[PDB]
Design a protein around this ligand. Structure first.
Ligand SMILES: Oc1cc(O)c2c(c1)O[C@@H](c1ccc(O)c(O)c1)[C@H](O)C2
Ligand SMILES: Oc1cc(O)c2c(c1)O[C@@H](c1ccc(O)c(O)c1)[C@H](O)C2
Ligand SMILES: N[C@@H](CCC(=O)N[C@@H](CS)C(=O)NCC(=O)O)C(=O)O
Ligand SMILES: N[C@@H](CCC(=O)N[C@@H](CS)C(=O)NCC(=O)O)C(=O)O
Ligand code: NA
Ligand code: NA
Ligand code: NA
Ligand code: NA
Ligand code: NA
Ligand code: NA
Ligand code: NA
Ligand code: NA
Ligand code: NA
Ligand code: NA
Lengths: 213, 213
């Protein structure tokens, strides 16, 4: 049984768990207490040498980097559950393109925002609201590209749900709830409909029930 | 024949071209003048809607995000030239892990450094040396993990050269030349040997001959 390391509430562990749930892969969650810096101490650095979560252990196989992990499990269990990768090399490439868009254009801004608005106040530090503003204005321009895409295609990589969509679930939820920036999605009709669809999937609802969201 | 858009000198176009050269894929380079902001104007935004390079056009197939592109061509031409992906799903996962390490842990720091040290002075702006210092200190800690890995494995993802190594070529060259931070590699014996190996590959030398490096 796969072991997943990290808090249930954290974005990158959730990305992994969402894929495992979609693919029907049993796992055991091992909390790592990011609040207290457990991920930076020697025991955990033997598992993830950059001191970040998640890592997975699957027998004597060990893997980190959330987007590497979801690609691995989507392939290992391709012929079960939803096709998350695409079939043809061109379909697979479009999944990869929209993962790459998620991982930089989108997530660099969303993380920055959530870190200032949500993470830092929890440890007694004021966020930099002016900086958050700059991220918000960049993110509107990124999401205008999403809206254009979703006007043409039901999901990001084509007409079916894939890893590309899945990878957005955890951070987007924080963006539109805890960070108070739901307008970024609600202002964009196709994006809003996409969000209400993907975030209502049974695997995601199960994970949110576990996490308390 | 594949069309690749972007300057020959730029990092992400070079990442793509390195893969095409390794795989023996013919291409035509279409310069995009980043110096003058061509990538932000309407004509180019029809090709890459985030206003960045590269994009590839391969008949009526269009793809952007450099790491999506190199995965596509490594798969489309798997049975020719070097195996860049790995064979087993676990080998492929380790390639993906080290691509993910390149794409965030490594490249976020190297880009930041090169932007301040190299890009901004070329447009008449002083870089923020204090900020560059902070990046340099983070990057030493990242590269200590690389050194540990390369003590155990010839290349990053295993005993052979893969996409994981390839993806580092363009930015590392800037880091150790134009940015003046060659000590980051030279200080680390296994990393230095890895660098002198991968950057001497014939495909890379050909590309550097084209680019003027
Ligand atoms: O330093 C931290 C500590 C945390 O507990 C978390 C951190 C950073 O980042 C959060 C996070 C928030 C938003 C994102 O887009 C993202 O990639 C990660 C994570 O959920 C939880
Ligand atoms: O705004 C720019 C303009 C550019 O011409 C370049 C930019 C940014 O980034 C450079 C760059 C430099 C270092 C990197 O690690 C990286 O990912 C990209 C690129 O080579 C060339
Ligand atoms: N590129 C990594 C990012 C991992 C990451 O940022 N993890 C966060 C949780 S979402 C973390 O461990 N934060 C605490 C820290 O960085 O100290 C991946 O995708 O796995
Ligand atoms: N995530 C993108 C990054 C592309 C990117 O940053 N491209 C740079 C060149 S290396 C660019 O176009 N810079 C100019 C700009 O951002 O305006 C990819 O990997 O393709
Ligand atoms: Na990780
Ligand atoms: Na990340
Ligand atoms: Na304001
Ligand atoms: Na698009
Ligand atoms: Na919890
Ligand atoms: Na691109
Ligand atoms: Na990038
Ligand atoms: Na100093
Ligand atoms: Na390692
Ligand atoms: Na040139």
């Amino acid at each position: 049984v796969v072991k997943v390391y990290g808090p249930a509430v954290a974005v990158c562990p959730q990305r992994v768990m969402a894929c495992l749930l979609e693919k029907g892969v049993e796992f055991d969650l091992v909390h790592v207490d990011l609040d207290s810096g457990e991920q930076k101490l020697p025991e955990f650095l033997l598992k993830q040498p950059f001191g970040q979560v998640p890592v997975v252990e699957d027998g004597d196989f060990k893997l980190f980097e959330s987007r590497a992990i979801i690609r691995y499990y989507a392939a290992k269990y391709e012929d079960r559950g939803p096709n998350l990768l695409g079939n043809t090399l061109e379909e697979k490439a479009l999944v990869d393109q929209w993962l790459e868009i998620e991982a930089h254009n989108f997530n660099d801004l969303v993380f920055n925002i959530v870190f200032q608005v949500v993470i830092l106040p929890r440890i007694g530090q004021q966020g930099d609201s002016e900086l958050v503003r700059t991220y918000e204005e960049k993110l509107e321009k990124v999401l205008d590209v999403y809206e254009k895409r979703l006007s043409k295609s039901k999901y990001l990589a084509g007409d079916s749900f894939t890893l590309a969509d899945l990878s957005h679930l955890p951070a987007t939820r924080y963006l539109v709830n805890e960070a108070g920036l739901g307008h970024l999605v609600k202002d964009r009709k196709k994006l809003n409909a996409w969000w209400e669809d993907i975030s209502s999937r049974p695997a995601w609802k199960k994970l949110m029930n576990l996490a308390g969201f």
